[PDB]
Structure 1
Amino acid sequence: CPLMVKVLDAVRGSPAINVAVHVFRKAADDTWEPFASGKTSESSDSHGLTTEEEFVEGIYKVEIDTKSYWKALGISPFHEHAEVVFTANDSGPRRYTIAALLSPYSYSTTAVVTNP
């Protein structure tokens, strides 16, 4: 797939399941146009959310509802959410894996961009 979003819980060492993910595209005038939306689930290596649509050139935003993940576990976390804002600047076809590693007071975000 052209986009893979993985969200990991670094305290449990597991995919963070039932996490809301919202992907957007920069529009003129600052507007963000919704591109994909979904919730994490698991089976095999696919412990994240995949879109089928490829990424033409632009600026994207991935929002991750990490506040609702922790609040479910009895934890009010530092971050109000995780956000990943990036350029898709190879105009030709690229694969994007975006991983978010979650703790109550920390997050980490990593991208892998490959050309198939």
Structure 2
Amino acid sequence: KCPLMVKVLDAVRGSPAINVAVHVFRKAADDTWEPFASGKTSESGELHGLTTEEEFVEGIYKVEIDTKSYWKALGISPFHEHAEVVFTANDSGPRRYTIAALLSPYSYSTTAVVTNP
């Protein structure tokens, strides 16, 4: 039951994306993004246990997905260098966040699911 989840899906072949790097940052006092967590997308196209419950604190976060390398490996030239999602976390209180990303060579869509523990 990790607090933050990231899901990546491929729309060209209708499969979860594999071997995709994901980076997470936290906004600092100097308005500078400092690294928070990182991971590699599995064959199932899902990440879990990136950040612990205690580590996840109030603030502004950025979840980055490196789509460019994934399409380079498959042999399709992509448009986006990366997809990044910026959101305020736990402003009202502790919550569970899910970030879903549907990927295409020239497009991508993202949604958020927020649930009360």
TM-score (norm 2): 0.85
Higher mean C-alpha displacement, 57-66 vs 40-49: 40-49
Shift of 1:78: 1.0
Relative distance call for 1:34 and 1:94 in structure 2 (3 A) is same
Shift of 1:45: 8.0
1:1-28 deviation line (CA, Å, top 9, x unaligned): 1011001111122211111000000002
Relative distance call for 1:33 and 1:112 in structure 2 (3 A) is same
Shift of 1:36: 0.9
1:38-95 deviation line (CA, Å, top 9, x unaligned): 0011469879967665532111001111000001111111111111111114352110
Tell me what 1:78 maps to.
Answer: 79
Q: What is the aligned length?
A: 116
Measure, in 2, the Cα distance between the counterparts of 1:109 and 1:45: 14
Relative distance call for 1:39 and 1:48 in structure 2 (3 A) is farther
Q: Unpaired runs of 5+ in structure 1? A: none
Measure, in 1, the Cα distance between the counterparts of 2:22 and 2:41: 8
Residue pair 2:24, 2:62 contacting (<8 A) in 1 also: yes
Higher mean C-alpha displacement, 6-15 vs 103-112: 6-15
Shift of 1:103: 0.3
Give SS of 2:46's match: coil
Measure, in 1, the Cα distance between the counterparts of 2:23 and 2:67: 12
Relative distance call for 1:46 and 1:29 in structure 2 (3 A) is closer
Residue pair 1:3, 1:54 contacting (<8 A) in 2 also: no
Higher mean C-alpha displacement, 90-99 vs 70-79: 90-99
TM-score (norm 1): 0.86
